[PDB]
């Protein structure tokens, strides 16, 4: 389970040069329950 500290590390390691998109939430989806690459990569910028 990716929690409130390593979540940013995992998101960076997944997104890379993509960056983060902008313009309930992510903590319950990924910390209160397990997530996969599918979910984490979705938050990366397109």
């Amino acid at each position: 389970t990716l929690c409130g500290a390593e979540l940013v590390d995992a998101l960076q390691f997944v997104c890379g040069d993509r960056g983060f998109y902008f313009n309930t939430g992510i903590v319950d989806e990924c910390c209160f329950r397990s997530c996969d690459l599918r979910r984490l990569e979705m938050y990366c910028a397109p």
């Binding site: 500290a5 390593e6 938050y43």
Partner: protein, 805 residues
């Protein structure tokens, strides 16, 4: 029992009823005396009942005028305690003018305890020993009376002393009697005045030692003329003390058959016992008074009145002994904190089918409900409010229910309930839920159970230990909850345990912050702690605990480590204290020492060194002639988690030596007669290799001197000079006592006065002995005595010479 047998009685109001104790030596039941509200010490002065010898409880309450039972019951010997009152076999309550007990002839109370309470005039309570009266003294209760707010003069007149709290006090009954303390060898059999142990069939006292016919009270059973162990085969046991043949039991049964209102019983013979009713599985043919095993199942159904019974005492449970099918509800309301597991299991053990609900309302002393040993199935046909067939409340010390790895319980209808069970973990409650079959087919409070109990089901595991002297390091595998931020830290406890006697329920608590988290199953710098310091040989018990923030919708007990006993490695011991040189012979000294108060390791053998000491140069040379903990739980642990979670939600938008063994003394031989000696002693603990002893204990030693040591041998050779100077030479003692410092020379003219001269060792060497000066002419005599460190030796042989003018 040289007397008559009468049943139990209750005496009240006018004192004339007390005369009914005409010639009753043994009572087949309780004796109560009550509400004698208009009686003065005058009334009780001339009434005595010495014939009574044995009581099967005894209760006195609200009697006025009576001062003591010293005259009322001078021969009441044994109170058995078959049927207790509440939990006690003797009760003395609110006695107004009672002054002293006076039951000096009371020896043993087999079953139960004693309670004296709320008196205002009695004395002599602290001067009675209950350990020699009843076995279980921890459950007695004497809380409030006279000689508890203002001490009396308890003048014990004859009265052996007993130790309590490490101090000895004499035990006495009245101002004229004292407790009869038989020796431990006699045990419960008793002894006479001479201390001879009574026969094994006697209890407390016996008229003549070693004779069942002379027992004052039979320990096991009583036959028509003699105390017996198990009654003769033609005589069955009855009321646990009598041996009665067919006639008595048959007459009792016939009398009960005649009386349709008497609360008697249709007595039956079974297993050589005449009992009111034989237990379940047996039925009466009504012909031979012998009940036989039944074909169809016939459980002992006990039709409870008003569909309900409350159990709060051994007397309440005893009314259900032998029952198997309860036709009603059941409430367990034990109070006081006294353990009642054994009696409850003995009385309610055979309970299998209960036709109602079971409720444990305020049972403070209970630890487990295992005493319902054969509780197969509860039916719940009669339910309380909320329709619960099983209720639990405020059970402060309740730890666990039936052993669910072995038990098998079935409930038919109704729900259950639980509340304020601080020592009951929720895991056992959920096991109860699933095992009974109630859940799913058809309650538990949120947080009221296991609040002060170790609910951490997860088990930690130690990894590496390194012990050395006063230091020890611990290390266990890491543990992480699903939300690693929940782990506030680690809780470490330890105790000094000489033996295995700790079960988590004194410790020294240490707080450890969690280690930094590292990804992968790689080494995460395994959490541990360094011990501050320990005794070099002590054994310690250690276990660690987790500290996690709870979530309302997510349970997380945490984890704990099993208690592990680790003893530190040994070091060199400490020096023994108080050695003394107890010299016994001219060459032997019995050194005496005692082990050090802090051996820090078992003593195997002392190391002994002794160094010879030359005498002091002064002798040779000198001429002598709780809010804060919940506070730290929320606003910087839970609050810090909220903002961090809130931020992620908003921003992430989806797309020479001697060894002495086992002996504190040593007799060193081969020593000098009086020479001073230096002694060194060390304690040693692990010297199978080269020695590792402690530092040396220092003592100066000196053997016994001898007179012959300072004795001068033979006469004294002499020389005469013309200047009235006489020089004399004598053999120096071969082995003087330590050191001869000076010589005493006595000279006297033949038939004339005697004079003395002091010659030192330096004077001895300078003049080569001694030289008498100023001697008058004529026949002369001289004698010499040697002075050593011990004293003076024998004088020389009489030496005679002549002096020339």
């Amino acid at each position: 029992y040289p007397g008559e047998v009468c049943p139990g009685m209750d005496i009240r109001n006018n004192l004339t009823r007390l005369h009914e104790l005409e010639n009753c030596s043994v009572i087949e039941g309780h004796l109560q005396i009550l509400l004698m509200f208009k009686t003065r010490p005058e009334d009780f002065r001339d009434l005595s009942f010495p014939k009574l010898i044995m009581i099967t409880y005894l209760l006195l309450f609200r009697v006025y005028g009576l001062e003591s039972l010293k005259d009322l019951f001078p021969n009441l010997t044994v109170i058995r305690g078959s049927r207790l009152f509440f939990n006690y076999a003797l009760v003395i309550f609110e006695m107004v003018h009672l002054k002293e007990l006076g039951l000096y002839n009371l020896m043993n109370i087999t079953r139960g305890s004693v309670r004296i309470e709320k008196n205002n005039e009695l004395c002599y309570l602290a001067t009675i020993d209950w350990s020699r009266i009843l076995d279980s003294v921890e459950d007695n209760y004497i809380v409030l009376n006279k000689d508890d707010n203002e001490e009396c003069g308890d003048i014990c007149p004859n009265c052996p002393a007993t130790v309590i709290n490490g101090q000895f006090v004499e035990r006495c009954w009245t101002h004229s009697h004292c407790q009869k303390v038989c020796p431990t060898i006699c045990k419960s059999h008793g002894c006479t005045a001479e201390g001879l142990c009574c026969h094994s069939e006697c209890l407390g006292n016996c008229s003549q030692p070693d004779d069942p016919t002379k027992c004052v009270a039979c320990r096991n059973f009583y036959l028509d003329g003699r105390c017996v162990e198990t009654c003769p085969p033609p005589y069955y046991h009855f009321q646990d003390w009598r041996c009665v043949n067919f006639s008595f039991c048959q007459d009792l049964h016939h009398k009960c058959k005649n009386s349709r209102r008497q609360g008697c019983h249709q007595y039956v013979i079974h297993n050589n016992k005449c009992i009111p009713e034989c237990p379940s599985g047996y039925t009466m043919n009504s012909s031979n008074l012998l009940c036989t095993p039944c074909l169809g199942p016939c459980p002992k159904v006990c039709h409870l009145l008003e569909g309900e019974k409350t159990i709060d005492s051994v007397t309440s449970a005893q009314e259900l002994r032998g029952c198997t099918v309860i036709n009603g509800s059941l409430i367990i309301n034990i109070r006081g904190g006294n353990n009642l597991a054994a009696e409850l299991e003995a009385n309610l053990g055979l309970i299998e089918e209960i036709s109602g609900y079971l409720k444990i309302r305020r049972s403070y002393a209970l630890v487990s409900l295992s005493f319902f040993r054969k509780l197969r199935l509860i039916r719940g046909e009669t339910l309380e409010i909320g329709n619960y067939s099983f209720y639990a409340l405020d059970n402060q010390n309740l730890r666990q229910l039936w052993d669910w790895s072995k038990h098998n319980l079935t409930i038919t209808q109704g729900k259950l309930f639980f509340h304020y069970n601080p020592k009951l973990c929720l895991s056992e409650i959920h096991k109860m839920e699933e095992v009974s079959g109630t859940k799913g087919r058809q309650d538990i409070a949120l947080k009221t159970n296991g609040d002060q109990a170790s609910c951490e089901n997860e088990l930690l595991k130690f990894s590496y230990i390194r012990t050395s002297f006063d230091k020890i390091l611990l290390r266990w595998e890491p543990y992480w909850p699903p939300d690693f931020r929940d782990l506030l830290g680690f809780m470490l406890f330890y105790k000094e345990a000489p033996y295995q006697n700790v079960t988590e329920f004194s410790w020294t608590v240490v707080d450890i912050d969690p280690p930094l988290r590292s990804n992968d199953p790689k080494s995460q710098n395994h959490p541990g702690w360094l011990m501050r310091g320990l005794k070099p040989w002590t054994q310690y018990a250690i276990f660690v605990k987790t500290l996690v923030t709870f979530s309302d919708e997510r349970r997380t007990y945490g984890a704990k480590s099993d208690i592990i006993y680790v003893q530190t490695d040994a070091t060199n011991p400490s020096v023994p204290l108080d050695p003394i040189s107890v010299s016994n012979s001219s060459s032997q000294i019995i050194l005496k020492w005692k082990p050090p108060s802090d051996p820090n390791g078992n003593i195997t053998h002392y190391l002994v060194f002794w160094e010879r000491q030359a005498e002091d140069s002064e002798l040779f040379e000198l001429d002598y002639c709780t809010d804060s903990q919940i506070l730290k739980e929320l606003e910087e642990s839970s609050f810090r988690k909220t903002f961090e979670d809130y931020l992620h939600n908003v921003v992430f938008v989806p797309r020479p030596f001697e060894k002495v063994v086992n002996k504190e003394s040593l007799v060193i031989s081969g020593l000098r007669h009086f020479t001073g000696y230096r002694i060194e002693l060390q304690a040693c603990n692990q010297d199978t290799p080269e020695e590792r002893c402690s530092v040396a204990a220092y003592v100066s030693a000196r053997t016994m001197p001898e007179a012959k040591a300072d004795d001068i041998v033979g006469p004294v050779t002499h020389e005469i000079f013309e200047n009235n100077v006489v020089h004399l030479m004598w053999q120096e003692p071969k082995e003087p006592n330590g050191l001869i410092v000076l010589y005493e020379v006595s000279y006297r003219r033949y038939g004339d006065e005697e004079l003395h001269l002091c010659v030192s060792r330096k004077h001895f060497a300078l003049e080569r002995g001694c030289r008498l000066r100023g001697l008058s002419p004529g026949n002369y005599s001289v004698r010499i005595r040697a002075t050593s460190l011990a004293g003076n030796g024998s004088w020389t042989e009489p030496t005679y010479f002549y002096v020339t003018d």
